[PDB]
Design a protein around this nucleic acid. Structure first.
Lengths: 254, 93, 253, 94, 268, 256
DNA sequence: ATTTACTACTCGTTCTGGTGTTTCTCGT
DNA sequence: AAACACCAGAACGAGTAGTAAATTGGGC
């Protein structure tokens, strides 16, 4: 359960979360009603708001437009010990990590991963087709494609996806640093989940915008992805996906 | 011996000259130098004495948590504020 | 141009903001009050910023504070910690390091015993489980509280102790985050969102922080909150707490 | 870690804010603080980058003969002068 | 408000002024040049200010420099001292008479010279040696030390002559003689009353300075002369600054003078 | 051998000789050799070549106020000649010789020799008695209200002015102002000794004369008065031989 | 020939209050 | 709703040139 509040002040009236928009009230939030609150630019949080959220256990995340980029989130490091250790155990065990990576592959393309292939081998197969997939989309939209204007658009797009993806990982209660396919990076786990749905809508839009060749493609792609995440409810479908991916380890979650 | 900084405003040429006898006027009304505690306390006498209707602030290096201390003379839009032992400066309208 | 956080030791410990609206003017932290006076807060200079009731932070404010690496803490009555905000996580290897240690009872016991050894200076009795050690731990803490009452002459005050420890909990959590570890994954304390914070802080808690609370508590001064904060401030400065925190966490593990 | 002083003039509000993130603006365009060598050399990168057609001087404490060093950015009536290793500042007339 | 001199150790060593007129604007030292650029010079921060040819000091300038306790030295070729001006009074009546009695007594004068010798080297001077004999020995050692330094740094050495290496040595020593004279005056003694050197207006300056001249100052001059820089004056001056800074010369001069005179075994 | 006072001009060397350039650009040639010491009054700007030349010929440079009224700085500080300093020293270091010098000062101050077998402590008592009486007499001669040392403000200003030319004379002679005989311990001890000798001659009575009237600015008036006296009565020029005469009373042969 | 107090007048920067424009320094 | 870029203004202090006044902060 998550809501996006923008352009207003977050206070607490009658023992409940409220957003004042110059016009008064406009939004009443019961306490058990929201699991986590995303704060878009234009918001001014009050002390009483934060005080109430802590008492009831609500995660606060400061996001850009539609979760396009994350800047700061409440309860940093983590909030639940169990959810972190769950993710940890999965990545520290060669047996468990392989299960999760295989599931990621299967979810990414729709077909089950080959049985006799290791993670290193899986990474290679994944790499081969995506390069080809980039080539296909380039021909489909009719653009001049070289090795990975277009690259600027794709980059802008992925940055947008990483926002909501990381925003989902935080709302789920997991750590973005502990990945399975990607490791060593501070946002490894973000890259894993995002790569799954990256070619779904994020990347094809980048090709669409690059074809029209806008003066400022950086902004156009961000606002496009912003619109995509809202309408296509990207963030809302991500959180169950994250839990589903980790569940492949066949270890009981919190 | 620690670093010293003096910033003067609306000060008569008498003190502006006096400060240039020990310190280095790097910018308009801004003096920088390295003196001792005893010498720092005499420069303040010069400031408190020759400046009558001007505002001056003196910042010197110490072994406090901030790494420095600062004292003021006269009135200004930017007056110092105490925040639980830590001193900052606020902008008055 | 990009802006990155400076080392924790090279910073001030804590500042307390209590009323007015916190905005971002021209790219800098400011505190505007009811009468319209503004106050700029060197946020990249402060390890942790405490936010008391009556403050209203803006979206850009939280954003700026995160990039410069300053921890924001919404504080309650007598300085008790309520909420906290920080960068959306931080280093994987350091985190998995902490994790593996906590996932293995054998390794976890090693860490807890070390904490005990560091806290009291003497090794813990052998063949004593984590559950058993915590029982001993409570006894030592309970006795230490009693002693301080006799040494400083107090009646067993709680407001002073809580406020002092809360300050330590602030920078401690700020240190754990800046180090790249998780404040939720503890060894002696568990189940709490600040388990690891309590573990590290409790080790050096009775060195100067808690007895000082009794010293302030010994007299009956006006506004005990201020008295404790500037006191704790001097401790963190004189005992070089911030510089000592990061090696301590790594030393324990 | 030694004392730091930055004096800015005719600089865009962009830099005036950035300096207030680490240093203390005691007077108009005057920032004072205590940083390390690595951080100080980072403050200068901020100045050289965000300050356009404006004059800024940064003075920090050292163990030199003066007890401190200072470097400038942009043009101003008060330019630094070398007197056999010793740096002073001269006042240029129009 | 009154103006007093600050301690010598808490000051910069030397500044070199070359052209322009030195006057006093708003109560402060400034150096205005032909093109009208001004340069403010903190006087009570410099132990001594060296004045090269082309400089024109004003009356208030000399007055101010005296009040702040800064020595003014008009210098010659390669910075050799010509003239000097300082507080007319200055000094301590007892400290002056102390130095006097030491030099007026043949027994005490020899004692002081022995201390200078002992301080100059690592070994005490040979007994039953007159001032005439000790000076003869000292000269031999000084001349020999110059030859040694020539071999260590690899220069073409003939003789120490005061009219590249000789230019460097003179320039380096000139800097030392500057601060030394500035120290003797601030301490309260007379630079004219010497023990090893006599008859000269700067006899005592040479006495104290010669003790520590070969410590770092003179050998440094050889280092610079080997390299043959375009501006040996600047190279040597900037070098000496670092020496005076690192070796805390200004801080070390005042106790040295007191230590030497103490060898007379008379309480000051 | 002589002495010169240069004011309101720049001291340079253009034709290889000392010149005094004036506001309208008048120069005045001054032979550097032949003059023992050059006094520089306010408004003067010495050049580098000038000082160097003065150094070569051995001429002392002393920065003085108007007519030597106040001394601010003098060339070759500390001293310039070792012998003249040691000469003065021996006189003060020997209790017997010191008494001789004090006696000479006494005889010169009043006109009559000091009583025999009197120590400095004994002599100072006599001196004090005579000074108080001289102050009282001057109060009677000029008719002012005297209560013992406005009038005091005038005298103080006058004596300060006198100390100027006196100290300037001691410097030109080559001696140290710190080594006194009647006065000791002070940095200007010797200055006080010589000045006290001729203070009641013209300096102090002039202070009473100005005090007799009532000008708005007695500080300047007394100084400007003393200035005029030192110029007209050529006091400083008369001082230098006096110092040598006083020190000669030690019956010790004086430096060449 | 200095130097300072004093006085308009010039010039320079800081600061403020008014709209118009954005929700924003990427690529793992 | 919050924050920056931008613009035009007032407001302030630093700086320059010219005029008139001194040659000076003391006492042994």
């Amino acid at each position: 359960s998550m809501i996006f509040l923008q352009y207003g002040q977050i206070d607490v009236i009658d023992g409940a979360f409220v957003l004042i928009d110059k016009t008064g009230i406009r939004t009443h939030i019961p306490v058990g009603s929201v699991a986590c609150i995303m704060l878009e630019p234009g918001t001014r949080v009050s002390h009483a708001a934060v005080r109430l959220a802590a008492q009831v256990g609500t995660l606060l995340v400061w996001v850009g437009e539609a979760g396009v980029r994350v800047y700061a989130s409440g309860q940093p490091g983590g909030a639940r010990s169990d959810k972190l250790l769950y993710q940890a155990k999965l990545a520290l065990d060669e047996d468990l990590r392989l299960k999760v990576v295989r599931k990621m592959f299967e979810l990414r393309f729709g077909e089950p991963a080959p049985a006799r292939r290791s993670v290193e081998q899986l990474r290679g197969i994944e790499g081969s087709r995506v390069r080809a997939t980039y080539a296909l989309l380039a021909k489909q939209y009719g653009v001049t494609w070289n090795g990975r204007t277009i690259n600027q658009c794709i980059s802008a797009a992925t940055s947008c996806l990483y926002g909501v993806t990381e925003a989902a990982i935080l709302a789920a209660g997991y750590a973005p640093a502990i990945g399975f396919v990607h490791t060593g990076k501070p946002l490894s786990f973000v890259y894993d989940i995002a790569d799954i749905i990256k070619f779904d809508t994020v990347v094809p839009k980048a090709f669409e915008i690059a074809r029209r060749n806008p003066g400022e493609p950086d902004r156009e792609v961000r606002l496009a992805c912003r619109d995509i995440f809202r309408s296509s409810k990207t963030l809302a479908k991500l959180i169950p996906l994250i839990e589903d991916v980790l569940a492949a380890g066949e270890i009981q979650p919190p | 011996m620690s670093m010293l900084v003096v910033v003067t405003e609306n000060v008569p040429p008498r003190l502006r000259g006096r400060l240039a006898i020990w310190l280095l006027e790097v910018r308009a009304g801004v003096y920088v130098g390295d003196v001792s505690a005893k010498i720092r306390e005499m420069i303040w006498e010069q400031i408190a004495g020759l400046a009558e209707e001007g505002n001056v602030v003196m910042a010197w290096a110490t072994n406090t948590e901030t790494g420095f201390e600062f004292q003021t003379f006269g009135l200004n839009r930017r007056t110092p504020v105490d925040l639980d032992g830590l001193r900052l400066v606020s902008f008055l309208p």
